[PDB]
Amino acid sequence: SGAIYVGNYRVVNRHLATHNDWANLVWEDSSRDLLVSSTTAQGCDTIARCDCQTGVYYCSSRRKHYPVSFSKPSLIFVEASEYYPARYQSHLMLAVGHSEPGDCGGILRCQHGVVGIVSTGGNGLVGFADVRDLLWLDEE
């Protein structure tokens, strides 16, 4: 689990979105595994605006933050998990590292802020859903 709280936005994995999230929907995209809902309270997470390929992510299944190198956001074939079939996922970045389904929502951060959240796992890779292209999270 986990989320990003920026301005009056909550960013979660689409597959973990709650009724309240859908009842306050701003934007969602299945192909990216992202959903954004509106919040009453102001959040303070800063979204990275950059092309960094190094950062640190939180892995709940190890109670650890790991420094990683990661690929640029791309359309990648993802093998079946507990929560999605085998399919193409867009805006996905991969690193060498540990990721189990419960790790989804863990933040990847660089020197500029939040890069994305854990979305995929398996075969010794961890996949992150990028948010750095979502420039509207910073406004309204």
50 is in an annotated binding site: yes
For strand 25-29 and strand 34-44, is the pairing parallel, antiparallel, or unpaired? antiparallel
Q: What is the CA radius of gyration of the chain?
A: 14
What residues from 14 to 43 belong to the interface with Zn ion (CB under 5 A)?
Answer: none
Q: Is 15 a catalytic residue?
A: yes
Specify the amino acid at residue 39: T
Size of the site for Zn ion (CB under 5 A): 5
Could you count the other beta carbons within 10 Å of the beta carbon of residue 139? 6
Instruction: Output the smallest distance, CB 50 to Zn ion, in A.
Output: 3
Q: Of the candidates 110, 117, 118, 134, which one interacts with Zn ion according to CB under 5 A?
A: 110
Residue from 12, 36, 47, 48 touching Zn ion (CB under 5 A): that is 48
Is 44 annotated in some ligand binding site? no
- Of 15, 29, 65, 98, which residue is the catalytic one? 15
- CA nearest neighbour of 105 among 55, 51, 34: 34
Structure tokens at 128: 């992150």
Residues in contact with Zn ion by the rule CB under 5 A: 48, 50, 52, 110, 112
By annotation, the residues acting in catalysis are 15, 33, 104
